[PDB]
């Protein structure tokens, strides 16, 4: 979970208990992208670079057998486990 996520979640609940629906639609989704896809930044991509190579190499060589490996959620988890 992200530093821009917990602050804005905090404001939408602190205003009113149902303002977690009412105070933020677009911002509730853009903070959800940070915990759904993570940032595209070079600083993260350098540390999980071996996963980031291997999960592209699944769809490079074996795109027809993605039940054996899939990218975006597996590649992300190996980043959050290191950085």
UniProtKB/Swiss-Prot annotation:
Domain CHCH: 1-42, 45-83
Nucleotidyltransferase keyword on record: no
Domain of life: Eukaryota
Keyword line: Acetylation, Disulfide bond, Mitochondrion
Cx9C motif 4, short sequence motif: residues: 69-79
GO biological process, alphabetically ordered: cellular respiration
Residue numbers covered by motif Cx9C motif 1: 2-12
CC per GO annotation: mitochondrial intermembrane space; mitochondrion
Motif, Cx9C motif 2: chain positions: 24-34
Subcellular localization(s) per the UniProt record: Mitochondrion intermembrane space
Motif (Cx9C motif 3): 48-58
Disulfide topology: 2-34, 12-24, 48-79, 58-69
Summary of subunit composition and partner proteins: Monomer.
Name of the protein this chain belongs to: Coiled-coil-helix-coiled-coil-helix domain-containing protein 5
Gene that encodes the chain: CHCHD5
């Amino acid at each position: 979970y992200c530093g821009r996520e917990l602050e804005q979640y905090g404001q939408c609940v602190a205003a009113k208990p149902e303002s977690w629906q009412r105070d933020c639609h677009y911002l509730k989704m853009s903070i959800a992208q940070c915990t759904s896809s993570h940032p595209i930044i070079r600083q993260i991509r350098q540390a999980c670079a071996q996963p980031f190579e291997a999960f592209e190499e699944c769809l490079r060589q074996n795109e027809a057998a993605v039940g054996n490996c899939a990218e975006h959620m597996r590649r992300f988890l190996q980043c959050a486990e290191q950085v």
